[PDB]
Amino acid sequence: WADYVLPLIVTVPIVVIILSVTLGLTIGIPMHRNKKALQAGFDLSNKKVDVLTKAVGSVFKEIINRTGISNAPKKLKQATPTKPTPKTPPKPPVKQ
């Protein structure tokens, strides 16, 4: 043995680098996907609630119209987050 000290100084950092990069990619790639899934899931939750709000609002509107109770609660309109899912501005096409 014992001839190998100078290549060990080359080889050890290279393996560490490869293993570190792989670890980075293996953790990094799913973290980006999780974020996107989480966002999509919340976006969908918000949409579903919005649909629910519209349905519940429609039923009330019809009940009110049919019972003569002329004052639909102004609050159902407010539950509809009219917040526009911030459309992450499409990353400008990096013109290569």
């Binding site: 939750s45 629910l52 349905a55 039923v59």
Partner: protein, 50 residues
């Protein structure tokens, strides 16, 4: 060994979080969808009976 433990230590929970998130969204969606359908059914009944 440390890099391997770190990889497993971060990798394993990241996968679990993804599965929990996915399962949790599906559950909320199902509930909301069921509620929406129920509300729609009552609407239909009110219109049909009045």
């Amino acid at each position: 060994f440390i890099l391997l433990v770190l990889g497993l230590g971060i990798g394993i929970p990241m996968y679990r979080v993804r599965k929990l998130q996915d399962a949790s969204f599906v559950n909320v969606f199902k509930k909301v969808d069921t509620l929406t359908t129920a509300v729609g059914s009552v609407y239909k009944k009110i219109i049909t009976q009045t």
